[PDB]
């Protein structure tokens, strides 16, 4: 009847950084310090997504990450929940572009007041222009 | 209180992808047993299913490197392995003066009718190319909808 849920999205203007905005947070969940703040204990369904693009390809090796992290009330420690890593640049270019999305999602026990980050190593290579399909969200079960 | 489960790779085990529930941020609730490396469904229903793996490689030895990931189901009554989800990735079009590492994740998933006592199985062909360097890089769970 009041099952916690949240879904947020990126900020296209924010000069090289993944700021989560214009926010659909319901039934307790908050967005504080760019971090989904849980409102109660239980079983939750946690996902996210981010998108990349680079013109050409630089020879110094390009390595793109994404990571959802739990900061538990139990230990105040930044535990990795979901994470991925990508190698767009294998060959240098001609100078033609490339695009690469990353998405994560799992079911997770969470506790009253656990904070959840969602971050990336290289905000400079974001592709904000793709109708803003760079999101983050959670859902109680 | 619906059956669910989320299990991650054991970082100890080398030449295999062993799933673990008894870890930080992993679980099995309401009858989703883990046995013979397989998730096991307590009762019949619509289930969300998903899995992720990640293949690091330290340079391209050759072009013919070929990575797979697959989630399959083995119903009791029928008994054969029915593939559900599937991926093939050849991450080396040409061998790389220096190595220059290459990563390659594979996320799979969908929503699937399951019978009681079905045995889901998320597997790969090259666990030598796995990456446990950081946590949360390799998992496999279900949720009853
Ligand atoms: N990350 C992601 N985003 C959107 C949805 C989503 N869900 C579904 C959900 C979401 C809310 C309430 C209920 C079901 C999951 C949530 C938790 C755990 C697991 C999944 C989950 C399962 C199976 C498949 C996927 C999935 C998603 N996105 C792709 N992308 C789309 C773009 N184009 C390339 C393919 N592919 C597969 C995701 N997860
Ligand atoms: N990219 C994306 N990725 C995941 C979900 C998602 N959407 C859908 C969407 C897609 C395109 C454009 C607009 C809306 C939503 C996005 C934001 C907020 C909400 C939804 C959203 C919509 C419709 C249904 C649901 C939904 C999920 N899960 C359950 N169940 C309840 C019973 N327990 C098991 C879970 N029920 C409903 C969720 N979009």
Which residues of chain A lie closer than 8 angstroms to B139, CB-CB? 82, 106
What the block records as the tokens of B132 is 């446990």
Q: Tell me if B141 and A106 make a contact (CB, 8 A cut-off).
A: yes
Characterise A76 by phi-psi region: left (phi > 0), alpha (psi -120 to 50), beta (else): left
Q: Which residues of A are less than 8 Å from B29 in CB distance?
A: 43
Nearest alpha carbon to residue B107 among A102, A126, A69: A102
CB of A99 within 6 A of ligand 1: the answer is no
Could you tell me where the beta strands, DSSP code E, fall in chain A? 5-9, 24-26, 30-32, 35-37, 42-54, 64-71, 78-86, 98-110, 115-119, 135-140
A137, A48 in Cβ contact below 8 A? yes
C-alpha angle A81-A84-A89 in degrees, rounded to nearest 5: 165
Residue-range domains of chain B with CATH = 1-145 (2.60.120.40)
Which CA distances in Å does A33 have to A19, A38, A122? 9, 13, 19
* B63 DSSP 8-state letter: S
Distance from C-alpha of B102 to C-alpha of B98, rounded to nearest angstrom = 12
The residue among B103, B134, B145 with the most chain A CBs within 10 A of its CB, best to mutate, is: B103
Count of CA atoms in the C-beta half-sphere (13 A) of A75: 6
Tell me the shortest Cα–Cα distance from B48 to chain A, in angstroms: 10
Residues A88, A98 contacting (CB under 8 angstroms) = yes
- Do the Cβ atoms of A10 and A70 come closer than 8 Å? no
Q: List the structure tokens of A96.
A: 């033609």
Residue labelled with tokens 């062909």: B125
């Amino acid at each position: 009847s009041d099952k916690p849920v949240a879904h947020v999205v990126a900020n296209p203007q924010a000069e090289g950084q993944l700021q989560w905005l214009n926010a659909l947070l319901a039934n307790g969940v908050e967005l504080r310090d760019n971090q989904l703040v849980v409102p109660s204990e239980g079983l939750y369904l946690i996902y996210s997504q981010v998108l990349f693009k680079g013109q050409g390809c630089p020879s110094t090796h390009v390595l793109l990450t994404h990571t959802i992290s739990r900061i538990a009330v139990s230990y105040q420690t930044k535990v990795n929940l979901l994470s991925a890593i990508k190698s767009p640049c294998q060959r240098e270019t001609e100078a033609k572009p490339w695009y690469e999305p990353i998405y994560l999602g799992g079911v997770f026990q969470l506790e009253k007041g656990d904070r959840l980050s969602a971050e990336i190593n290289r905000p400079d290579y974001l592709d904000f222009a793709e109708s803003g399909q760079v999101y983050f969200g959670i859902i109680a079960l």
